[PDB]
């Protein structure tokens, strides 16, 4: 059924832009219960997989996305002690350590304060956070040639990568 929604909105190139992706995911039902995704979330989604640097996404990259979404949806549900579609600060920190990140308390704090609406973290923000977390790390790893946990960036390169995400 997946291809059906993709194709339904895909362009002449068989690729979707952030706006079409949004429609596709929504018409998809993946977030059926929860808060539908925002255009900003969808833009980060594309940037996370835009290796050809076109601002669009093909069905092969979409399949990777889909895999990642259902995985993140799973974690959201398992930290969702209860139900309502919103997680708590603590519930969020636990989800992040669950995806394999080992961030410090201050950084985690920053991240949470970034996506909080009344001590709550809605589904959309939770997924935006997951996608951005990955995109940034991939960008950083590519600059950390010896994998030392540090990297040197030249201004223009630094900007191009972070503005894109």
Binding residues for Ca(2+), as ranges, are 13, 17, 19, 80, 82, 84, 86, 91
Binding to Ca ion in span 83-102, by CB under 5 A: 84, 87
Out of Ca ion, a second copy, none, what residue 84 binds, judged by CB under 5 to 8 A for its kind, is: Ca ion
Span of 22-30, 66-74, 77-85, 104-112 interacting with a second copy by CB under 8 A: 104-112
Question: Can you give 85-146 as a three-state secondary structure string?
Answer: CEECHHHHHHHHHHCCCCCCHHHHHHHHHHCCCCCCEEHHHHHHHHHHHHHHHHHHHCCCCC
In whole angstroms, what separates CA 50 from the centre of its chain? 13
Span of 27-35, 61-69, 77-85, 114-122 interacting with a second copy by CB under 8 A: 114-122
Which residues are 57's β-sheet partners? 16
Q: Does 117 bind a second copy (CB under 8 A)?
A: yes
After which residue numbers is the chain interrupted with C–N beyond 2.5 angstroms?
Answer: none
| Nearest to 47, CA basis, from 131, 130, 129, 123 | 131
Cα separation, 50 vs 16, in Å, equals: 11
Span of 23-31, 57-65, 87-95, 109-117 interacting with a second copy by CB under 8 A: 109-117
Farthest-apart Cα atoms in the chain, separation: 46
Residues that bind Ca ion (CB under 5 A): 80, 82, 84, 87
Residues that bind a second copy (CB under 8 A): 19, 38, 40, 43, 47, 53-55, 103-104, 106-107, 110-111, 113-114, 116-117, 129, 132-133, 136-137, 140, 144, 149-156, 158-160, 162-165
């Amino acid at each position: 059924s997946v291809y059906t929604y993709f194709s339904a909105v895909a362009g002449q190139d068989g690729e979707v832009d952030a706006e079409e992706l949004q429609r596709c995911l929504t018409q998809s039902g993946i977030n059926g219960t929860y808060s539908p995704f925002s255009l900003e979330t969808c833009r980060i989604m594309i940037a996370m997989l835009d290796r050809d640097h076109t601002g669009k996404m093909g069905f092969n990259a979409f399949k990777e996305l889909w895999a990642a979404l259902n995985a993140w949806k799973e974690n959201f549900m398992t930290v969702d002690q209860d139900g309502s579609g919103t997680v708590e600060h603590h519930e969020l920190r636990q989800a992040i350590g669950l995806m394999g990140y080992r961030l410090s308390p201050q950084t985690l704090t920053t991240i949470v304060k970034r996506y909080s609406k009344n001590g709550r973290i809605f589904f959309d923000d939770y997924v935006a956070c997951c996608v951005k977390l990955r995109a940034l790390t991939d960008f950083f790893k590519k600059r950390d040639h010896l994998q030392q946990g540090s990297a040197d960036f030249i201004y223009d390169d630094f900007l191009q990568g972070t503005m894109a995400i």
